[PDB]
């Protein structure tokens, strides 16, 4: 997030980090319950990857994080790779997350929910803070 | 391929089409043997997808094509999603292709092979012929 | 790429107003946010865009795409969860 | 999106000459081709870029990325198979 700030450690409990077996953080994600993760379908997640939960500082070693294994990648069939439309995939965890003070689910809206333009919202992540 | 031509049917036997369970062609690929396919890692192929071989006209019904099921997606660990560098994934077929007059393997080069600038080469596919 | 988690507040835009920046790339299952001095960037994809509805944070968008430079004057594009939640519910229910 | 398979002949460029178009985006495991009047485009990714070496077509590149408009004056970017074949060989051998 270019021009963002550092977050309060543990303040966004649903935020996860998708890392390949090399340890490289390539995408983010959101926990919707102890067994399901939501991320972008374009992330190209495979079952060989890992979901990291309860992480704040990717460079710390004393963090009691949760390295979670992916059972199945559920790419939304409407997903259009040429347009990047309907960019969503569900990740079914083989090993369910352990909810705590730093690990929990974000709520999902009604198909009918309204989010008016002008509403200030929040986005999080470990993306580049500078290009 | 913008500004290309139609190919001779069956002339590029290794070319495959990756289609989701909706039937939507989203990426291309190349057969390196009866059990392995090479495509871009950014295509975000899952095991729920299908590899189509021996296809020429995606709209024809009388084509004796080969709908192949994916056993495992092997995303190159060097793959860097932020830079799109090392953009390669191997697809291990659960059901091996049947080589014929329209289905075969492309050769792979030596790590030491040289391909000088100026060399005219050929690229194929079902990508947009116009943006 | 920062070691620790970043956060940023940002306004949602209307698709129409967003189309002024992106044209016909902006589809119905997409929602725009940003062009406010901040910007999502490479490595943020799959991440959350949340709004507090009735005291609880609710997933409104999924960090999708945007400016290749991550320009803070250009609105980022996120997957519109509102138009995708039915697929989610159906998928959770059957697996 | 055409129903039937398209083909196109195109020249390979040097990375350095390619960097004039793309700058520091062009990495070592990437090889450029095009800017010749033709252009790979959306849906071509994962596809092959081949050169005939000794009478046989050999996989030199994998359709990766390029101009968002698919400009025929802008060189397309393909995955450099030469710098990736060792990974391939190792992976085939162990599975």
């Amino acid at each position: 997030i270019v021009n963002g700030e550092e977050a309060v450690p543990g303040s966004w409990p649903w935020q996860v980090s998708l890392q390949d077996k090399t340890g490289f953080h390539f995408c983010g994600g959101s926990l919707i319950n102890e067994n399901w993760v939501v991320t972008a379908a374009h992330c190209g997640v495979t079952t060989s990857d890992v979901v990291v939960a309860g992480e704040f500082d990717q460079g710390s070693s004393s963090e009691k994080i949760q390295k979670l294994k992916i059972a199945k990648v559920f790419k939304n069939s409407k997903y259009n790779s040429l347009t990047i439309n309907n960019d969503i995939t569900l990740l079914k965890l083989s090993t369910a997350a352990s909810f705590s003070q730093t690990v929990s689910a974000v709520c999902l809206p009604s198909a009918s929910d309204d989010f008016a333009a002008g509403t200030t919202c929040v986005t999080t992540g470990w993306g580049l803070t500078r290009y | 391929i913008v500004n290309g031509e139609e190919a001779v049917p069956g002339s590029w036997p290794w070319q495959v089409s990756l289609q989701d369970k909706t039937g939507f062609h989203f990426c291309g690929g190349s057969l390196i043997n009866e059990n392995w396919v090479v495509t871009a890692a950014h295509c975000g192929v899952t095991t729920s997808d299908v590899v189509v071989a021996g296809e020429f006209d995606q709209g024809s019904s009388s084509e004796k094509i080969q709908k192949l099921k994916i056993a495992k997606v092997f995303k190159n660990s060097k793959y860097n999603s932020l830079t799109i560098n090392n953009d390669i994934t191997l697809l291990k077929l659960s059901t091996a292709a049947s080589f014929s007059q329209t289905v075969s393997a492309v050769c792979l080069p030596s790590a030491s092979d040289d391909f000088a600038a100026g060399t005219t080469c050929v690229t194929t596919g079902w990508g947009l012929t116009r943006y | 790429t920062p070691d620790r988690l970043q956060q940023a507040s940002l306004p949602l835009l209307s698709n129409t107003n967003c189309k002024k920046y992106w044209g016909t790339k902006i589809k119905d299952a997409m929602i725009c946010a940003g062009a406010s001095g901040v910007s999502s960037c490479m490595g943020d994809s799959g991440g959350p865009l949340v709004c507090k509805k009735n005291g609880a944070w609710t997933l409104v968008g999924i960090v999708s795409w945007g400016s290749s430079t991550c320009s803070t004057s250009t609105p980022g594009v996120y997957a519109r969860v509102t138009a995708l939640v039915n697929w989610v519910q159906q998928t959770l229910a059957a697996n | 999106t055409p129903d039937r398979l398209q083909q196109a002949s195109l020249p390979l460029l040097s990375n350095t000459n390619c960097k004039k178009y793309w700058g520091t985006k062009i990495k070592d495991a990437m090889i450029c081709a095009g800017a010749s009047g033709v252009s790979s485009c959306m849906g071509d990714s994962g596809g092959p870029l081949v050169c005939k070496k000794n009478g046989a077509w050999t996989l030199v590149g994998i359709v990766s990325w390029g101009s968002s408009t698919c400009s025929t004056s802008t060189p397309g970017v393909y995955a450099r198979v030469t710098a990736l074949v060792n990974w391939v060989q190792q992976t085939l051998a162990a599975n």
Binding site: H42, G127 | - | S40, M42, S64, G66 | -
Partner: peptide, 4 residues
């Protein structure tokens, strides 16, 4: 890229 272009995509995040």
């Amino acid at each position: 890229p272009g995509v995040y």
